[PDB]
Design a protein around this ligand. Structure first.
Ligand SMILES: CCCOP(=O)(O)OC[C@H]1O[C@@H](n2cnc3c(N)ncnc32)[C@H](O)[C@@H]1O
Length: 652
């Protein structure tokens, strides 16, 4: 029938298509969608945003969405080949003016940040007025340290609301902020501090996350032992517990800010001035974004992928150390002038009901999280969500990895009660903003499909064995883009050759995401996993999401990862690392029978070749702080944080 199949699901294809629900049709007093009600309404608007006549739309959106000090004249220029991408180059603006000042001038008492503290009872709303005053104070403090336009400033802050003020204070004066996930080791912090050559660092005395203390200042003290360029450290008093402070070098955030005025002017920034550096986990890649294209891209995707409306309370549960936090906690939502959540805790603290307690307390209208969090709460059962309201939500988003249809259905049935649109949002740090996602008022969804590309995104499928584009539908290969879009990364910091070689060289003429992808018979796009994770069994090229979505169809399975290994008879062979739910009786099911049933399930939905050669039952998989599964690690172990010793021990 079809060359390309959906990710394995227990639900039949003919009953697995989800039209926008009533909460996304302008019924029950909910806002009418910006784009709707159907696929044709998405195509009609999307077509204006790509092709040789798309400048007019982008020019209008740029002028309508952002406040400019100087207008631009050129809409776009440059290209992939040399990495000289330009958007609105003659224009000037300020990101902090667009995220704070203009909204403060309209409604200063409107809530900018819902600060959901690690302890629920310490939460509160932070108005645009308060956020802007604190941003301006910090901006004044940085100027007193001699920080100039174009200087780098490192940020090592946990998920307290002042992290937005630190970002936006750097943006306000034209400094380039480099945020580092709070909790990274002293060595990882040091490597990123030295690479951006910053002279100022911002951090807390301590962090709080899940009832546990992050010793940020002690970590900072170990790191700066090898960072000779850092002269000033601004220390936010988050807990007030005793930490070491170095005379002269270190200062308390509150005592410095109390000396400064509560307003600070905005540096007028060129469209292409660098806004930030964001390192991704070879050596750390300093991904650089400029100002206007990135801001416009986060503003537009937030408005259209989540159907944001003025009074919305947008809840992105990620961390600001991640691009997801950059684009859909701070810049995107604050640019649109709505309320945004800064969530300091974990999904299971104090109990696995926290997400849903949070939604009903604040009456959030959109929730945006990661598959790893969705599969975690699935592992915990349905009683932490069944007895909540959750009816203020209209849209639920998933980001970071392919979402298995099992998880997609749990999300849809319990978080949304079958009344929310599910937006599977595909993008990368290097894309700046969401690349492929359903528009929730228009697109009928399929579990595990990102569906259709966003405005400005013209994507295609290349057969990696020929280097040539595959025309039509029902094709599979590697995902590429044909043209720059406004928010694409502009370089890798002081390493432009790595930028060109990684993204622009593999398929000359295109941008190479690094993900395997398929376009099915309806034109829906499926992102199936990293190209490096593809497993080649006797010609059959298997993707990680494919096999993992099959394995999770078996009862008792909480999460899985599969990697390839050298096999003489099949080229490569599939090896599966399976995580079971805690209450699964492993003594009653003889493990060899479990592994046998798992092979049968994979052979049924995928084919005989896809059955794992070996299956390792483990307690947890190696994962990053954002929740990406570390298949490279498992692949290396099967070929010769504490969860890494368990994997090596179970494989020997
Ligand atoms: C955007 C937040 C994550 O940014 P990062 O730069 O950390 O990682 C990007 C990678 O995450 C995966 N990825 C992310 N989102 C999806 C997604 N929605 N579906 C399938 N794969 C995904 C894709 O493999 C991609 O190359």
């Amino acid at each position: 029938v079809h060359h390309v199949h959906p990710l394995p699901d227990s639900v039949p294809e003919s009953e697995d298509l989800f039209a926008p629900p009533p909460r996304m049709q302008g019924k029950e007093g909910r806002p009418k969608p910006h784009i709707g009600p159907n696929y044709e309404s998405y195509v009609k608007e999307w077509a204006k945003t790509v092709g040789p006549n798309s400048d007019e739309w982008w020019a209008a959106k740029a002028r309508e969405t952002l406040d400019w000090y100087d207008d631009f004249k050129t809409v776009r220029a440059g290209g992939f080949e040399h990495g000289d991408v330009q958007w609105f180059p003659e224009g000037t603006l300020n990101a902090a003016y667009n995220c704070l000042d203009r909204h403060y001038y309209k409604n200063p008492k409107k809530t900018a940040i819902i600060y959901e503290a690690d302890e629920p009872s310490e939460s509160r709303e932070v108005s645009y007025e308060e956020l802007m005053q604190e941003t301006c104070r910090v901006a004044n403090v940085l100027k007193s340290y001699g920080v100039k336009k174009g200087d780098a400033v490192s940020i090592y802050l946990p998920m307290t609301w002042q992290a937005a003020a630190a970002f936006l204070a750097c943006a306000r004066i034209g400094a380039i902020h480099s945020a580092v996930f709070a909790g990274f080791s002293a060595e990882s912090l040091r490597d990123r501090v030295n690479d951006c050559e910053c002279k100022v660092l911002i951090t807390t005395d301590e962090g709080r996350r899940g009832g546990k203390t992050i010793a940020t200042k002690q970590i900072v003290d170990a790191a700066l032992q090898q960072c000779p360029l850092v002269e000033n450290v601004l220390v936010l008093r988050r807990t007030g517990n005793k930490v070491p402070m170095t005379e002269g070098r270190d200062k308390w955030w509150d005592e410095e800010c109390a000396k400064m005025p509560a307003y600070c002017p905005c540096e007028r920034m060129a469209s292409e001035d660098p806004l930030f550096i964001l390192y991704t986990s070879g050596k750390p890649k300093g991904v650089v974004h400029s100002t206007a294209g990135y801001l416009l891209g986060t503003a537009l995707t937030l408005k259209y992928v989540f159907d944001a409306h003025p009074d919305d309370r947008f809840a992105c549960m990620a961390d600001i150390g991640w691009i997801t936090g950059h684009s859909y906690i701070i810049y995107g939502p604050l640019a649109n002038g709505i309320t945004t959540a800064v969530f300091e805790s974990t999904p299971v603290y104090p109990t696995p009901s926290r997400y849903w307690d949070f939604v009903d307390k604040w009456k959030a209208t959109q929730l945006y999280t990661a598959p790893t969090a969705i599969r975690l709460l699935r592992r915990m059962g349905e009683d932490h969500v069944k007895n909540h309201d959750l009816s203020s939500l209209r849209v639920l988003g998933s980001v970071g990895e392919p979402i298995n249809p099992e998880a997609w259905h749990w999300y849809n049935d319990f978080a949304g009660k079958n009344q929310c649109a599910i937006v599977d949002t595909y993008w990368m740090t290097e894309t700046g903003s969401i690349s492929i996602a359903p528009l929730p008022g228009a697109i009928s969804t399929k579990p595990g499909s990102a569906t259709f590309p966003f405005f400005g995104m013209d994507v295609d499928i290349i057969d990696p064995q020929t280097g040539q584009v595959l025309e039509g539908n029902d094709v599979e290969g590697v995902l590429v883009a044909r043209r720059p879009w406004p928010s694409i990364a502009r370089t890798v910091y002081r390493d432009h050759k790595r930028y060109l070689e990684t993204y622009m060289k593999p398929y000359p003429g295109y941008f190479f995401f690094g993900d395997g992808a398929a376009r099915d018979y309806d034109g829906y796009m499926w992102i199936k996993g990293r190209v490096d994770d593809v497993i080649n069994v006797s010609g059959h090229r298997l993707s990680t999401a494919e096999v993992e979505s099959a394995l999770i169809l078996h009862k008792g399975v909480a999460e899985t990862a599969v990697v390839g290994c050298a096999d003489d008879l099949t080229g490569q062979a599939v090896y599966a690392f399976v995580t079971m739910k805690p209450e699964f009786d492993l003594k009653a099911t003889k493990e060899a029978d479990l592994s046998k049933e798992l092979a049968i399930q994979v052979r049924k939905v995928i084919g005989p070749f896809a059955a794992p050669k070996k299956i390792y039952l483990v307690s947890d998989l190696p994962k990053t702080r954002s929740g990406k599964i570390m298949r490279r690690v498992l692949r290396k172990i099967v070929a010769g944080p504490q969860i890494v010793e368990e994997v090596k021990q179970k494989v020997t």
